[PDB]
Amino acid sequence: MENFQKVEKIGEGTYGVVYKARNKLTGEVVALKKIRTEGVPSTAIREISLLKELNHPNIVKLLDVIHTENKLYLVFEFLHQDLKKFMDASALTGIPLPLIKSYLFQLLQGLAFCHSHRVLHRDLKPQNLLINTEGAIKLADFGLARAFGVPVRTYTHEVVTLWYRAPEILLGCKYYSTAVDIWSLGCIFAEMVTRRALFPGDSEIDQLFRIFRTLGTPDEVVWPGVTSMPDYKPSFPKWARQDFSKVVPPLDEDGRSLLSQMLHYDPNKRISAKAALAHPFFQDVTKPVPHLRL
Numbered sequence: 001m002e003n004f005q006k007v008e009k010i011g012e013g014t015y016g017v018v019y020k021a022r023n024k025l026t027g028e029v030v031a032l033k034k035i036r037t038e039g040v041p042s043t044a045i046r047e048i049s050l051l052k053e054l055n056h057p058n059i060v061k062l063l064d065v066i067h068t069e070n071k072l073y074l075v076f077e078f079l080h081q082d083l084k085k086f087m088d089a090s091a092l093t094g095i096p097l098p099l100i101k102s103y104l105f106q107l108l109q110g111l112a113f114c115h116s117h118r119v120l121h122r123d124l125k126p127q128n129l130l131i132n133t134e135g136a137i138k139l140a141d142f143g144l145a146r147a148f149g150v151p152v153r154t155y156t157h158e159v160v161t162l163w164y165r166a167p168e169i170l171l172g173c174k175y176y177s178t179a180v181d182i183w184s185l186g187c188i189f190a191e192m193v194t195r196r197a198l199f200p201g202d203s204e205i206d207q208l209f210r211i212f213r214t215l216g217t218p219d220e221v222v223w224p225g226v227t228s229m230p231d232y233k234p235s236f237p238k239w240a241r242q243d244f245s246k247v248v249p250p251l252d253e254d255g256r257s258l259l260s261q262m263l264h265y266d267p268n269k270r271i272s273a274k275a276a277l278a279h280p281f282f283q284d285v286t287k288p289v290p291h292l293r294l
């Protein structure tokens with residue numbers, strides 16, 4: 001490294017290998033993501049560079065975009081743990097409701113900020129939500145999906161998780177809206193509460209059908225235009241909707257109400273991050289300190 005010193009391999013992210021590294025000059029510790037494949041579209045360089053200006057306390061800071069030796073590296077502020085690991089660690093006892101609420105509230109503030117700046121995440125998942133010892137949680141990888149248009153894979157054949165994908169994406173809609181992020185966050189909220197993924201599909205159709213089996217197969221009444229979507233098939237089985245009381249027990253009615261609005265089928269009916277922040281569920285929100293073992 002011309003200015004870094006690898007501390008260790010943090011993982012093999014969706015867009016390449018990630019290392020924890022120390023800037024030999026500043027001494028700062030950062031996350032360095034090597035971007036995957038053979039060309040690096042200058043279009044992406046400009047778009048990514050724009051994200052360097054997207055600063056908010058609940059968004060992982062993109063410190064630098066390094067395009068040298070015809071390679072692309074993203075330098076991000078470093079956080080010690082992701083929500084997936086934290087949820088697994090809290091599996092026996094569950095994350096306390098006050099902390100679940102604090103995290104959801106913070107994540108919505110982060111989304112409201114990005115969305116007001118016309119930046120979508122598109123691939124939110126527990127592994128992309130980073131936490132620290134202060135009780136903060138931050139969204140990582142905002143805007144990379146668009147800047148890199150197509151997703152595909154990482155670089156070492158890894159199974160893309162579809163668990164948090166909004167139904168309009170699964171039905172082949174080519175135009176994503178801010179609503180896809182609200183859907184993903186709703187799925188994560190449910191998972192924090194129950195300690196089980198809400199819709200753990202293992203294929204695109206299994207993902208879609210798991211959603212239908214829980215929320216009911218969508219129709220023109222609840223989702224105008226759904227039957228004209230690219231991958232919609234009249235042959236889809238028609239399942240009845242289940243009650244949220246059975247989906248995320250023992251979450252209270254304020255929580256079920258908010259989740260239901262985050263999971264509406266019609267992206268246009270789905271609650272916005274700004275509106276969600278005003279939901280009665282957050283009347284008593286606080287910022288607890290999590291028990292983090294690093």
Ligand SMILES: CCCCCCNc1cc(NCc2cccnc2)c(C(N)=O)cc1[N+](=O)[O-]
Pocket residue numbers: 010011012013018020030031032033060076077078079080081082130140
């Ligand atoms: C099995 C762990 C999966 C990590 C995959 C890489 N995922 C990332 C994880 C991060 N930190 C949380 C963390 C997690 C584990 C160890 N140490 C720190 C960070 C960051 N900004 O600090 C960035 C990325 N990433 O995507 O650039």
